[PDB]
Amino acid sequence: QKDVTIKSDAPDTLLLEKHADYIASYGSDYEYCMSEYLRMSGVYWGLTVMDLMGQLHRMNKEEILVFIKSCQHECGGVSASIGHDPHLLYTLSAVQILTLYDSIHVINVDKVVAYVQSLQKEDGSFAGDIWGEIDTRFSFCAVATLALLGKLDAINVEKAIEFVLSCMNFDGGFGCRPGSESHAGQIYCCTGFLAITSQLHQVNSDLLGWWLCERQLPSGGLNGRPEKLPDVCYSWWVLASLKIIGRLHWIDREKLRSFILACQDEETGGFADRPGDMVDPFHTLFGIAGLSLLGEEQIKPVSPVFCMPEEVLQRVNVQPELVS
Amino acid sequence: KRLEREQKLKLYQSATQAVFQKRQAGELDESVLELTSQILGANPDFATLWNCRREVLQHLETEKSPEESAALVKAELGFLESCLRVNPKSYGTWHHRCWLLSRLPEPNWARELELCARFLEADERNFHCWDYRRFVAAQAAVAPAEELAFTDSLITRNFSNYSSWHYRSCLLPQLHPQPRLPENVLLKELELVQNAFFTDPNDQSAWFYHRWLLGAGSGRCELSVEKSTVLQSELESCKELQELEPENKWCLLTIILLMRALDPLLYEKETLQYFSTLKAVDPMRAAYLDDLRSKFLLENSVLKMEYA
Ligand SMILES: COc1ccc(S(=O)(=O)N2Cc3cc(-c4ccc(C=O)o4)ccc3N(Cc3cncn3C)C[C@H]2Cc2ccc(OC(=O)NCc3ccccc3)cc2)cc1
Ligand SMILES: [Ca+2]
Ligand SMILES: [Zn+2]
């Protein structure tokens, strides 16, 4: 019942040239400065969306590679920015960027692997950093990082699988930790995890697929759990999860596409979380990635597992089999 | 309006500079707690600053008395609670509280459970708070039965129930911990959930939980007279509801599921009829509904082939 009403003057055409201008000029500002704590991921979002649009060249490779190297700490982990602390979230982001750039040896890969290895707990879970927060998001960061480096064998995979499956819920979904309620974000992370570790046969695809397709609201937009507002980034979380489990056809593609197009800003470029709100590069990546999954011809095919161009992943030979 | 924030940015920027300079200097002191409090209130997702607070608190406990360390802990609890009042949905703030409580000699868990009850009164769907509550319940070794009493009160006092039903799905198996629910428990849960969705037939949470309960038994070939009779009664009650709310998709889906739970082949004709109606009422789910129906027809073909 909680939904947004798309007003009839909302954008209904893909403004790609505008989006690429928006990202190309991003960080040339109040909000830029206040999100320094996620900079490495911000950089990943901008570069990935640019590459999906064929505009990667307009970004600054040389400058990003020096930034990334300065963000690797003596433990092997990578921080969001210089002087910030290392975390699995930013280690993943850094590794996705270097994968996009074919420059993995810009950082010490052996130390990244040792960092990831060090964060696994006896029950198979991963902490995000030395301070011990446990989340299935971090199980995904860990195996995704290692998959991209060809080093999945470095962790205890069966225990890691056991922990993730212990976060499966009555409704077929997954939460942060055992007993946590199902949420699209964690479902995305856990289905991604199970794709990487070849365990999708353990998902109840019909049950989870139904929970996911019930995320679509009359507006066409997807929410992240029951009784919440729709949002462009859930487009992505939910749609990617559906693709991994072979049930993408269970949502109304055309209604979702109209929702996503309605979140664009016709003047400034970029996408917001919902129509008419202020845009950012996070929702710009996920709007564009969502459209690509829906089969938008002007955007490169995107991996539902790694949220990177498929041609990048083909090139490193890391393409997990999905359900169907 | 868009001028003062240039000055608020100025304060954020220099405080942030200050904290990092002090940290490089090995100055793990109260001035960093001062600076970080001024940034984390507005910006609790700045993870590195939570790490600095922990580093300071760890350091200070080495060179302060039990009394002075006890005072720092209580000041940290108040700071944390003021942060949560401003932003109750920050991973960082909740983890810090967990970190803090996990290292105290004698933590007060009854108080932490009450903090949870209060935040859940504000927002019954706050999963950080539900997660914290499960953490506190475990640490205090609170019994499944008590948490079950907490959920009941929450479900009836108002809606926004998905989180409370989810918690029940996890608690119930613990009260009957096999290496599936016992029928007596299952029947009691069916009565509770069915009350919920006849009270508010638009609350999707009860319907999702009811679909789970429908699978959580022992199979249609094993139906007791009592379970058989309860399910038939649910079927007639949903048909009643369908008259009142012809646009209600959850009741139509549930009718199909009930007929399946009762007798797939005897109800084959009505099942097919209900699929047509439901697809007309919920067209965005047409593809799902066609796939579900194809699954059910295959099940039926196998049942017809099982014949002697
Ligand atoms: C506004 O205060 C904030 C609150 C939270 C965050 S956040 O950092 O926690 N993160 C990103 C996020 C970024 C911006 C933002 C602003 C400016 C810029 C500019 O750069 O970006 C804004 C919002 C926002 N939100 C909050 C939101 C959005 N819509 C509704 N809400 C409530 C989502 C959130 C969830 C999240 C958590 C972990 C994660 O990592 C992985 O899961 N990695 C594995 C993976 C690998 C590959 C692909 C996908 C995933 C990714 C996303 C940041 C700011
Ligand atoms: Ca360039
Ligand atoms: Zn969002």
XYZ file of C-alpha atoms and ligand atoms in Angstrom:
688
model
C 0.000 0.000 0.000
C 2.927 2.368 0.664
C 3.956 3.336 -2.856
C 5.070 6.369 -4.849
C 2.807 7.838 -7.526
C 4.742 8.607 -10.709
C 3.573 12.016 -11.945
C 2.988 12.139 -15.708
C 5.852 14.546 -16.565
C 8.506 12.120 -15.221
C 11.291 11.145 -17.707
C 10.474 8.190 -20.016
C 13.597 7.966 -22.188
C 17.203 6.951 -21.383
C 19.392 10.063 -20.940
C 22.736 8.311 -21.259
C 24.812 11.280 -22.490
C 23.543 13.251 -19.450
C 24.473 10.466 -17.010
C 28.011 10.172 -18.364
C 28.403 13.968 -18.027
C 27.135 13.771 -14.468
C 29.628 11.052 -13.473
C 32.540 12.521 -15.492
C 32.103 15.821 -13.552
C 31.434 14.256 -10.119
C 33.985 15.388 -7.512
C 34.734 18.769 -9.160
C 31.088 20.327 -3.201
C 29.266 19.666 0.088
C 28.187 16.047 -0.324
C 31.387 14.995 -2.013
C 33.290 15.927 1.064
C 30.937 14.315 3.531
C 31.066 10.865 1.887
C 34.900 10.603 2.001
C 34.348 7.614 4.325
C 33.019 5.606 1.306
C 35.246 7.144 -1.398
C 36.732 3.875 -2.705
C 33.212 2.527 -3.311
C 32.064 5.844 -4.779
C 34.981 5.508 -7.220
C 33.914 1.898 -8.002
C 30.297 3.045 -8.650
C 31.329 5.880 -11.016
C 33.826 3.810 -12.996
C 31.539 0.807 -13.330
C 28.566 2.841 -14.550
C 30.859 4.699 -16.967
C 32.220 1.416 -18.299
C 28.666 -0.011 -18.743
C 27.952 3.117 -20.861
C 31.246 2.722 -22.818
C 32.573 5.978 -21.293
C 35.314 4.620 -18.986
C 38.079 6.487 -20.893
C 36.735 9.820 -19.618
C 37.779 8.868 -16.086
C 41.322 9.147 -14.722
C 43.003 5.747 -14.640
C 46.484 6.847 -13.544
C 45.135 8.930 -10.683
C 42.845 6.171 -9.385
C 45.666 3.599 -9.409
C 47.868 5.810 -7.191
C 44.894 6.431 -4.864
C 44.233 2.681 -4.554
C 47.883 1.877 -3.734
C 47.953 4.606 -1.076
C 44.840 2.986 0.451
C 46.355 -0.469 1.009
C 47.457 -0.837 4.646
C 50.257 -2.967 6.106
C 47.728 -5.697 7.038
C 46.788 -6.112 3.358
C 43.358 -4.521 3.689
C 42.202 -1.462 1.827
C 40.507 1.645 3.223
C 37.865 3.884 1.638
C 40.325 6.769 1.557
C 43.821 7.773 2.669
C 44.052 7.790 6.464
C 40.826 5.838 6.930
C 40.835 2.270 8.236
C 40.879 -0.920 6.123
C 37.640 -2.818 5.618
C 36.361 -5.703 3.474
C 33.851 -3.354 1.783
C 36.654 -1.176 0.351
C 38.986 -4.063 -0.288
C 36.263 -5.486 -2.569
C 35.714 -2.097 -4.243
C 39.443 -1.639 -4.837
C 39.707 -5.117 -6.359
C 36.695 -4.523 -8.595
C 38.295 -1.266 -9.832
C 41.675 -2.945 -10.555
C 39.784 -5.712 -12.334
C 37.999 -3.134 -14.497
C 41.452 -1.632 -15.226
C 43.399 -4.926 -15.583
C 45.830 -3.539 -12.975
C 45.493 -6.017 -10.102
C 49.200 -5.962 -9.369
C 48.970 -2.277 -8.449
C 48.358 -3.710 -4.947
C 49.904 -6.573 -3.026
C 47.549 -9.430 -3.869
C 49.174 -11.915 -1.450
C 48.509 -9.498 1.392
C 44.868 -8.893 0.309
C 44.315 -12.647 0.427
C 45.899 -12.874 3.870
C 43.710 -9.987 5.066
C 40.520 -11.685 3.863
C 41.646 -15.057 5.328
C 42.251 -13.342 8.712
C 38.662 -12.123 9.008
C 36.942 -15.533 8.855
C 35.619 -16.828 12.182
C 35.312 -20.386 13.541
C 31.661 -20.600 12.497
C 32.665 -19.671 8.915
C 31.373 -16.082 9.011
C 33.363 -13.007 8.142
C 33.966 -9.881 10.178
C 34.208 -6.679 8.132
C 37.370 -5.655 9.913
C 39.343 -6.185 13.133
C 36.453 -4.751 15.142
C 34.349 -7.854 14.614
C 31.026 -6.836 13.037
C 29.584 -10.017 11.484
C 27.352 -9.695 8.408
C 26.638 -11.910 5.423
C 27.495 -8.779 3.366
C 31.081 -9.549 4.449
C 30.835 -13.216 3.415
C 30.012 -11.907 -0.046
C 32.808 -9.264 -0.004
C 35.268 -11.984 1.021
C 34.438 -14.605 -1.670
C 33.858 -11.983 -4.383
C 37.270 -10.443 -3.679
C 38.941 -13.839 -3.655
C 37.088 -15.030 -6.816
C 38.337 -11.963 -8.679
C 41.926 -12.795 -7.594
C 41.609 -16.537 -8.334
C 42.125 -17.310 -4.665
C 38.787 -18.650 -3.379
C 40.670 -21.695 -2.063
C 42.336 -19.459 0.553
C 39.332 -19.538 2.914
C 37.322 -22.309 4.552
C 34.564 -22.507 1.948
C 32.391 -25.267 3.416
C 32.277 -23.456 6.779
C 31.592 -20.201 4.955
C 28.697 -21.901 3.145
C 27.372 -23.377 6.380
C 27.202 -19.925 7.977
C 25.412 -18.331 5.009
C 22.847 -21.133 4.876
C 22.259 -20.706 8.629
C 21.037 -17.187 7.728
C 18.277 -18.611 5.462
C 14.809 -17.770 6.707
C 11.224 -19.117 6.717
C 10.398 -17.051 3.642
C 13.358 -18.308 1.581
C 15.374 -15.118 2.079
C 18.471 -14.180 4.084
C 19.428 -11.666 6.764
C 22.631 -10.164 8.265
C 23.229 -12.928 10.791
C 21.464 -16.055 12.009
C 17.890 -15.174 13.003
C 17.945 -11.828 11.140
C 14.924 -10.901 9.053
C 15.017 -11.196 5.251
C 16.084 -8.031 3.403
C 16.789 -7.563 -0.352
C 20.316 -6.307 0.302
C 21.329 -9.413 2.226
C 19.481 -11.662 -0.229
C 21.576 -10.127 -3.013
C 24.778 -10.738 -1.017
C 23.876 -14.299 -0.077
C 22.637 -15.396 -3.528
C 25.805 -13.791 -4.949
C 27.819 -15.740 -2.365
C 26.096 -18.978 -3.294
C 26.634 -18.324 -7.002
C 30.386 -17.855 -6.396
C 30.677 -20.961 -4.236
C 28.479 -23.101 -6.589
C 25.669 -23.675 -4.045
C 22.519 -22.298 -5.706
C 20.890 -25.729 -5.531
C 20.549 -24.966 -1.790
C 18.269 -21.947 -2.425
C 14.508 -22.531 -2.642
C 14.233 -20.559 -5.888
C 10.456 -20.785 -6.150
C 9.913 -19.578 -2.566
C 12.589 -16.860 -2.595
C 11.587 -15.875 -6.111
C 8.035 -15.320 -4.965
C 9.183 -13.140 -1.996
C 11.342 -11.137 -4.434
C 8.655 -10.629 -7.089
C 6.210 -9.487 -4.380
C 8.678 -6.565 -3.868
C 7.234 -4.929 -7.031
C 4.682 -2.210 -6.262
C 1.867 -0.820 -8.447
C 4.245 2.013 -9.390
C 6.477 -0.650 -10.992
C 9.328 0.038 -8.531
C 10.794 -2.557 -6.157
C 11.094 -2.246 -2.359
C 13.604 -4.041 -0.128
C 11.095 -5.672 2.176
C 7.385 -5.747 2.925
C 5.625 -2.450 3.571
C 8.502 -0.166 2.520
C 8.729 2.455 -0.233
C 10.175 1.523 -3.627
C 13.679 2.666 -4.488
C 16.008 2.443 -7.501
C 18.772 0.616 -5.648
C 16.355 -2.241 -4.769
C 15.620 -2.445 -8.444
C 19.138 -3.728 -8.556
C 19.298 -5.874 -5.343
C 16.027 -7.649 -6.124
C 16.483 -7.960 -9.900
C 20.022 -9.235 -9.657
C 18.924 -11.799 -7.038
C 16.050 -12.913 -9.311
C 18.507 -13.289 -12.210
C 20.910 -15.357 -10.114
C 18.076 -17.763 -9.138
C 16.560 -17.904 -12.639
C 13.330 -15.992 -11.910
C 13.854 -12.545 -13.497
C 10.698 -13.054 -15.592
C 8.642 -13.021 -12.388
C 8.599 -9.208 -12.306
C 6.837 -6.920 -14.793
C 9.888 -5.714 -16.747
C 8.162 -2.819 -18.513
C 6.612 -1.352 -15.359
C 10.011 -1.567 -13.604
C 11.798 0.045 -16.548
C 9.346 2.995 -16.435
C 9.962 3.367 -12.697
C 13.718 3.414 -13.165
C 13.518 5.924 -16.048
C 11.272 8.119 -13.871
C 14.087 8.363 -11.250
C 16.428 10.160 -13.681
C 17.081 13.896 -13.353
C 16.530 15.459 -16.784
C 18.565 18.592 -15.922
C 21.498 17.426 -13.747
C 21.722 13.851 -15.043
C 22.124 10.881 -12.672
C 19.419 8.850 -10.888
C 17.837 9.375 -7.478
C 16.369 6.722 -5.155
C 12.893 7.804 -6.264
C 11.431 10.204 -8.873
C 12.205 13.897 -8.333
C 14.660 13.317 -5.445
C 18.277 14.428 -5.614
C 20.570 12.121 -7.579
C 23.833 10.451 -6.578
C 26.364 8.104 -8.252
C 25.269 5.085 -6.131
C 21.681 5.163 -7.468
C 23.048 6.049 -10.890
C 25.045 2.816 -11.004
C 22.131 0.734 -9.759
C 19.535 2.352 -12.046
C 21.778 1.779 -15.076
C 22.746 -1.748 -13.986
C 19.025 -2.494 -13.421
C 18.143 -1.347 -16.961
C 20.937 -3.478 -18.400
C 19.635 -6.592 -16.633
C 16.228 -5.754 -18.130
C 17.885 -5.824 -21.605
C 18.589 -2.172 -22.479
C 20.582 -2.273 -25.760
C 22.612 0.980 -25.204
C 24.168 -0.396 -21.974
C 26.719 -3.219 -21.742
C 25.529 -6.529 -20.231
C 26.191 -6.481 -16.468
C 27.079 -9.409 -14.180
C 24.290 -9.903 -11.599
C 26.894 -11.399 -9.233
C 29.746 -8.840 -9.402
C 27.846 -5.769 -10.754
C 30.565 -5.217 -13.374
C 30.460 -5.482 -17.193
C 30.263 -9.180 -18.178
C 33.045 -8.651 -20.753
C 35.396 -7.733 -17.906
C 34.537 -10.972 -16.060
C 34.840 -13.072 -19.223
C 38.300 -11.577 -19.617
C 39.371 -12.810 -16.127
C 37.408 -16.076 -16.558
C 35.277 -15.695 -13.409
C 31.694 -16.279 -14.445
C 29.696 -18.335 -11.931
C 26.836 -20.467 -13.304
C 23.379 -19.166 -12.312
C 20.181 -21.197 -11.869
C 18.468 -20.288 -15.189
C 20.249 27.941 4.852
C 22.720 27.006 2.091
C 25.425 29.154 3.728
C 25.644 27.875 7.329
C 26.249 24.321 6.037
C 29.378 25.696 4.339
C 30.334 26.631 7.918
C 29.105 23.272 9.309
C 31.277 21.653 6.625
C 34.138 23.860 7.865
C 33.694 22.516 11.415
C 33.354 18.893 10.223
C 36.493 19.306 8.088
C 38.778 20.745 10.800
C 37.497 18.383 13.518
C 38.181 15.478 11.122
C 41.678 16.895 10.371
C 42.238 17.264 14.116
C 41.258 13.676 14.952
C 43.572 12.235 12.291
C 46.508 14.422 13.342
C 46.024 13.341 17.010
C 45.826 9.690 15.989
C 49.089 9.814 14.027
C 50.658 11.449 17.124
C 49.626 8.556 19.424
C 47.408 10.965 21.377
C 44.711 8.497 22.439
C 42.927 10.896 24.822
C 39.585 12.496 25.763
C 40.049 15.293 23.234
C 39.498 12.714 20.463
C 36.270 11.611 22.181
C 35.287 15.293 22.201
C 36.079 15.770 18.492
C 34.476 12.498 17.397
C 31.250 13.212 19.338
C 30.886 16.379 17.245
C 31.094 14.401 13.961
C 29.450 11.032 14.748
C 26.172 12.649 15.861
C 25.444 13.890 12.339
C 27.617 11.376 10.522
C 27.438 7.965 12.263
C 28.409 6.042 9.103
C 31.965 7.447 9.382
C 33.314 4.035 10.533
C 36.900 5.085 11.118
C 35.818 7.514 13.852
C 34.013 4.709 15.761
C 37.336 2.805 15.522
C 39.171 5.812 17.012
C 36.678 5.949 19.883
C 37.329 2.265 20.601
C 41.110 2.753 20.404
C 40.925 5.633 22.880
C 38.637 3.713 25.259
C 40.905 0.659 25.103
C 43.983 2.803 25.795
C 42.425 4.805 28.650
C 41.366 1.629 30.513
C 45.081 0.749 30.803
C 45.969 3.985 32.626
C 42.813 4.836 34.598
C 41.188 3.381 37.694
C 38.237 0.947 37.687
C 36.146 3.932 38.852
C 37.314 6.303 36.093
C 36.902 3.547 33.454
C 33.424 2.753 34.764
C 32.571 6.453 34.327
C 33.859 6.498 30.733
C 31.700 3.457 29.931
C 28.555 5.147 31.300
C 29.373 8.330 29.343
C 29.736 6.153 26.231
C 26.324 4.562 26.796
C 24.699 8.001 26.959
C 26.526 9.211 23.896
C 25.436 6.076 22.018
C 21.815 6.534 23.052
C 21.819 10.187 21.944
C 23.245 9.067 18.572
C 20.534 6.409 18.159
C 17.811 8.959 18.878
C 19.080 10.988 15.894
C 19.774 7.983 13.611
C 18.429 4.594 14.758
C 19.435 2.871 11.481
C 23.229 3.151 11.458
C 25.154 -0.141 11.481
C 28.095 1.677 13.083
C 26.254 2.923 16.147
C 24.635 -0.420 16.959
C 27.908 -2.350 16.540
C 29.724 0.070 18.819
C 27.131 -0.532 21.532
C 27.534 -4.302 21.063
C 31.335 -3.923 21.199
C 31.004 -1.849 24.377
C 28.557 -4.182 26.187
C 30.505 -7.340 25.218
C 33.597 -6.186 27.151
C 31.963 -5.033 30.439
C 32.409 -7.209 33.549
C 28.813 -6.831 34.673
C 26.654 -5.493 31.856
C 23.064 -4.629 32.659
C 21.100 -6.656 30.085
C 17.616 -6.060 31.521
C 18.204 -2.375 30.799
C 19.387 -3.140 27.252
C 16.214 -5.210 26.629
C 14.171 -2.196 27.718
C 16.092 0.053 25.339
C 15.077 -2.416 22.583
C 11.401 -2.366 23.601
C 11.475 1.453 23.432
C 13.108 1.645 19.986
C 10.691 -1.043 18.739
C 7.810 1.115 20.019
C 9.165 3.899 17.819
C 9.753 1.612 14.790
C 8.579 -2.008 14.949
C 10.465 -2.781 11.704
C 13.927 -1.581 12.787
C 15.985 -4.694 12.037
C 19.123 -3.266 13.695
C 17.099 -3.084 16.891
C 15.633 -6.577 16.470
C 19.194 -7.834 15.799
C 20.426 -6.061 18.920
C 17.564 -7.583 20.907
C 18.524 -11.134 19.826
C 22.107 -10.319 20.832
C 21.009 -9.118 24.277
C 18.614 -12.073 24.748
C 21.448 -14.505 23.963
C 23.960 -12.746 26.275
C 21.408 -12.708 29.107
C 20.351 -16.272 28.200
C 16.681 -15.223 27.925
C 14.411 -18.168 27.117
C 12.559 -18.625 23.790
C 9.270 -18.670 25.730
C 9.722 -15.105 27.023
C 10.594 -13.741 23.584
C 7.501 -15.527 22.267
C 5.374 -13.578 24.810
C 6.987 -10.330 23.596
C 6.065 -11.063 19.957
C 2.370 -11.814 20.692
C 1.804 -8.460 22.400
C 3.487 -6.693 19.475
C 1.380 -8.376 16.756
C -1.993 -7.553 18.346
C -1.316 -4.001 19.625
C -0.884 -2.731 16.015
C 0.291 -3.680 12.475
C 3.790 -3.427 10.922
C 4.164 -7.089 11.894
C 6.621 -8.684 9.391
C 9.504 -8.437 11.870
C 7.516 -9.942 14.753
C 6.223 -12.860 12.663
C 9.770 -13.500 11.440
C 10.996 -13.657 15.025
C 8.224 -16.180 15.810
C 9.327 -18.399 12.903
C 12.771 -18.614 14.613
C 11.560 -18.976 18.206
C 8.945 -21.721 17.677
C 11.419 -24.302 16.370
C 13.586 -23.576 19.469
C 10.758 -24.399 21.886
C 10.451 -27.750 20.082
C 14.061 -28.333 18.952
C 14.331 -31.423 16.720
C 17.422 -32.221 14.578
C 8.555 -28.781 10.993
C 6.386 -27.974 14.009
C 4.403 -30.356 16.230
C 0.743 -30.342 15.188
C -0.548 -28.875 18.473
C 1.864 -25.941 18.111
C 1.069 -25.645 14.384
C -2.706 -25.535 15.025
C -2.270 -22.811 17.671
C -0.151 -20.748 15.214
C -2.709 -21.173 12.442
C -5.394 -19.813 14.774
C -3.236 -16.803 15.685
C -2.229 -15.992 12.082
C -5.730 -16.456 10.702
C -7.005 -13.982 13.354
C -4.427 -11.518 12.045
C -5.322 -11.715 8.358
C -9.081 -11.654 8.952
C -8.524 -8.620 11.183
C -6.387 -6.854 8.542
C -6.613 -8.716 5.198
C -4.186 -6.194 3.602
C -1.307 -6.983 5.994
C 0.888 -9.129 3.757
C 3.017 -10.344 6.683
C 0.399 -12.719 8.130
C -0.212 -14.244 4.662
C 3.529 -14.886 4.142
C 3.781 -16.487 7.583
C 0.620 -18.551 6.935
C 2.131 -19.922 3.697
C 5.108 -21.090 5.750
C 2.863 -22.803 8.323
C 1.026 -24.605 5.525
C 4.311 -26.264 4.528
C 5.542 -26.783 8.105
C 3.327 -29.808 8.866
C 3.447 -33.504 7.977
C 1.717 -33.895 4.559
C -1.786 -34.149 3.060
C -1.831 -37.965 3.161
C -1.313 -37.713 6.942
C -3.995 -35.088 7.736
C -5.617 -35.656 11.118
C -9.366 -35.131 11.329
C -8.671 -31.966 13.342
C -6.151 -30.525 10.857
C -8.305 -31.543 7.918
C -11.197 -29.748 9.600
C -9.228 -26.583 10.486
C -7.902 -26.257 6.901
C -11.398 -26.716 5.367
C -12.616 -24.029 7.780
C -9.787 -21.712 6.664
C -10.792 -22.386 3.052
C -14.421 -21.327 3.722
C -13.288 -18.307 5.689
C -11.036 -17.176 2.800
C -13.919 -17.584 0.354
C -15.987 -15.406 2.678
C -13.202 -12.814 2.646
C -13.060 -13.063 -1.179
C -16.722 -11.916 -1.309
C -15.896 -8.909 0.902
C -12.593 -7.976 -0.799
C -12.671 -9.184 -4.453
C -9.469 -7.258 -5.225
C -7.536 -9.054 -2.389
C -4.893 -11.187 -4.059
C -3.517 -12.770 -0.863
C -6.798 -14.494 -0.026
C -7.079 -15.957 -3.575
C -3.509 -17.279 -3.503
C -4.151 -18.771 -0.047
C -7.331 -20.542 -1.295
C -5.193 -22.244 -3.976
C -2.564 -23.204 -1.403
C -5.211 -24.568 0.961
C -6.791 -26.722 -1.746
C -3.291 -28.069 -2.481
C -2.764 -28.808 1.213
C -6.168 -30.560 1.277
C -6.472 -32.579 -1.993
C -4.709 -31.547 -5.239
C -6.781 -33.814 -7.545
C -10.218 -33.361 -5.938
C -9.794 -29.576 -6.188
C -8.097 -29.521 -9.622
C -11.018 -27.759 -11.329
C -11.425 -25.036 -8.691
C -7.631 -24.607 -8.529
C -7.585 -23.823 -12.250
C -10.519 -21.381 -11.794
C -8.734 -19.593 -8.954
C -5.585 -19.147 -11.054
C -7.609 -17.310 -13.713
C -9.200 -15.020 -11.147
C -5.912 -14.326 -9.354
C -4.038 -13.489 -12.563
C -6.810 -10.966 -13.394
C -6.548 -9.426 -9.911
C -2.699 -9.431 -9.718
C -1.414 -9.110 -13.303
C 2.175 -8.135 -12.346
C 2.510 -11.679 -10.904
C 1.054 -13.415 -14.011
C 4.394 -15.053 -14.913
C 4.929 -16.345 -11.366
C 1.362 -17.591 -11.252
C 1.716 -19.451 -14.558
C 4.918 -21.101 -13.332
C 3.267 -22.065 -10.014
C 0.307 -23.524 -11.858
C 2.578 -25.500 -14.227
C 4.340 -26.891 -11.145
C 0.989 -27.874 -9.622
C -0.188 -29.592 -12.841
C 3.040 -31.618 -12.955
C 2.513 -32.627 -9.301
C -1.024 -33.668 -10.270
C 0.155 -35.729 -13.253
C 2.513 -37.628 -10.947
C -0.407 -38.240 -8.526
C -2.675 -39.477 -11.355
C 0.179 -41.777 -12.517
C 0.656 -43.155 -8.959
C -2.762 -44.794 -9.529
C -3.137 -48.569 -9.312
C 22.995 8.767 3.162
O 23.716 8.130 4.235
C 24.240 6.930 3.846
C 23.767 5.740 4.400
C 24.306 4.514 3.998
C 25.327 4.470 3.042
S 26.015 2.918 2.518
O 27.457 3.083 2.122
O 25.917 1.928 3.651
N 25.219 2.291 1.177
C 25.432 3.126 -0.046
C 24.715 4.488 -0.101
C 25.490 5.469 -0.718
C 24.996 6.767 -0.866
C 25.772 7.762 -1.471
C 25.739 9.082 -1.260
C 26.654 9.667 -2.035
C 27.269 8.713 -2.728
C 28.397 8.969 -3.740
O 29.287 8.149 -3.971
O 26.740 7.499 -2.402
C 23.722 7.066 -0.387
C 22.939 6.089 0.226
C 23.448 4.793 0.377
N 22.632 3.911 0.960
C 21.552 4.314 1.880
C 20.216 4.251 1.120
C 20.065 4.258 -0.204
N 18.765 4.194 -0.485
C 18.092 4.139 0.663
N 18.992 4.176 1.637
C 18.665 4.136 3.087
C 22.745 2.484 0.661
C 23.839 1.830 1.499
C 23.677 0.273 1.332
C 24.942 -0.524 0.944
C 25.614 -1.254 1.925
C 26.756 -1.982 1.597
C 27.224 -1.987 0.280
O 28.343 -2.709 -0.028
C 28.082 -3.923 -0.599
O 27.000 -4.482 -0.402
N 29.045 -4.447 -1.351
C 28.911 -5.727 -2.054
C 28.546 -5.385 -3.499
C 29.459 -5.592 -4.529
C 29.125 -5.273 -5.842
C 27.875 -4.734 -6.130
C 26.961 -4.521 -5.100
C 27.295 -4.842 -3.782
C 26.549 -1.259 -0.704
C 25.406 -0.532 -0.372
C 25.800 5.666 2.500
C 25.259 6.889 2.894
Ca 41.068 9.021 -18.887
Zn 18.402 3.287 -2.371
